[PDB]
Design a protein around this ligand. Structure first.
Ligand SMILES: NC(=O)c1ccc[n+]([C@@H]2O[C@H](COP(=O)([O-])OP(=O)(O)OC[C@H]3O[C@@H](n4cnc5c(N)ncnc54)[C@H](OP(=O)(O)O)[C@@H]3O)[C@@H](O)[C@H]2O)c1
Ligand SMILES: O=C(O)Cc1c(Cl)cccc1Cl
Length: 315
């Protein structure tokens, strides 16, 4: 609709605002603008280094009475250096302090890979490569389940998990809470048909990240393709009197996915909201799906030898 039903009975808004790469100095205004414009879902993470400033915006709009807490859907994620059972609660509480909230609507395991705990987000050894933790996914899931029982979070989920990693959790002896959501990279160049079908069959809601192809990703090359500039996608947009961004945001919505485009620009934040007033035809949808090239923008290349690296499996 405008909201999808999760397995805990809560409704998740189908459109949310992304905050990765949003500078601390600009993200407070961006969130304020988003809330005014009508966004009710914000995607956060400790690793984005801007939760405090996102929290400032949320507090201002709650105090102004523009929104009530219950109408907001706030998401954050447990970083890889906090997968140890004894660290999960502390990480969640830090995020809660920064955002200035008493609960999260949804808390995700950010990546299936655990790293060595410490101050560095990507701890490195003497040579090449990230230092892994010997923790596994099931022990981390058990720690996440405790967060629900303690009232710190309403729902728990996963991000960048392949179907075998999802299976692992679903077959966990004594599984108490199923993952509500799997947040994955998804756009016309990486359509994820198999993983999406798999998750939806298990009652797991899929959130599509990098829906515009993350043009501001720090490792972008000038030779790299651009979704926003694809003349085939421009042509569909022109047919509907919409922008290519609007088409790219509407696309996942019609696949029953939640989508979280990032912007710090008030005019683009507003433009990205205007996606409820048109429909892509079944022809448009089939055509957009045909553009798949299995091109993955977020491949976590420093973790390719990690025992839990998600992207060796087909899906
Ligand atoms: N779970 C995970 O591992 C994971 C990984 C990656 C991302 N995410 C989440 O997904 C969010 C979205 O992905 P993303 O940040 O990679 O990139 P994205 O949303 O695909 O693209 C963001 C870029 O597109 C620009 N943009 C936004 N609206 C536009 C419009 N209407 N017209 C032209 N350009 C527009 C933004 O510019 P301006 O900001 O300058 O306006 C920014 O440079 C993230 O912020 C994060 O919340 C999660
Ligand atoms: O994990 C994320 O959400 C975004 C991210 C970060 Cl913060 C750092 C390196 C790579 C990537 Cl994809």
């Amino acid at each position: 609709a405008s909201r999808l039903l999760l397995n805990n009975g809560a409704k998740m808004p189908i459109l949310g605002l992304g905050t990765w790469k949003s500078p601390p100095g600009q993200v407070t205004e961006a969130v304020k603008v988003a809330i005014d414009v009508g966004y009710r879902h914000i995607d956060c993470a400790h690793v984005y280094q801007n939760e405090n400033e996102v929290g400032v915006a949320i507090q201002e709009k709650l105090r102004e009475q523009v929104v009530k807490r219950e109408e907001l859907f706030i998401v954050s994620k447990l970083w890889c250096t906090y997968h140890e059972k004894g660290l999960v609660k502390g990480a969640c509480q830090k995020t809660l302090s920064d955002l200035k909230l008493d609960y999260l609507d949804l808390y995700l395991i950010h990546w299936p890979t655990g790293f060595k705990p410490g101050k560095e987000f990507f701890p490195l050894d003497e040579s090449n490569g990230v230092v892994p933790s010997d923790t596994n996914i099931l022990d981390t899931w058990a720690a996440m389940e405790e967060l629900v029982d303690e009232g710190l979070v309403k729902a728990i989920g996963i991000s960048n998990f392949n179907h075998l990693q999802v299976e692992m959790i679903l077959n966990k002896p004594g599984l108490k809470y199923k993952p509500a959501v799997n947040q994955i990279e998804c756009h016309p160049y990486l359509t994820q048909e198999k993983l999406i079908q798999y998750c939806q069959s298990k009652g797991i809601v899929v959130t599509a990240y990098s829906p515009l192809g993350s043009p501001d990703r720090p490792w972008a090359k000038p030779e790299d393709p651009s979704l926003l500039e694809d003349p085939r996608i421009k042509a569909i947009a022109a047919k509907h009197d919409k922008t290519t961004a609007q088409v790219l945001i509407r696309f996942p919505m019609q696949r029953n996915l939640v989508v979280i485009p990032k912007s710090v620009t008030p005019e683009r934040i507003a433009e990205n909201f205007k996606v409820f007033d048109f429909e892509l035809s079944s022809q448009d949808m089939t055509t957009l799906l045909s553009y798949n090239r299995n091109w993955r923008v977020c491949a976590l290349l420093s973790c390719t030898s990690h025992k839990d690296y998600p992207f060796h499996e087909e899906f």
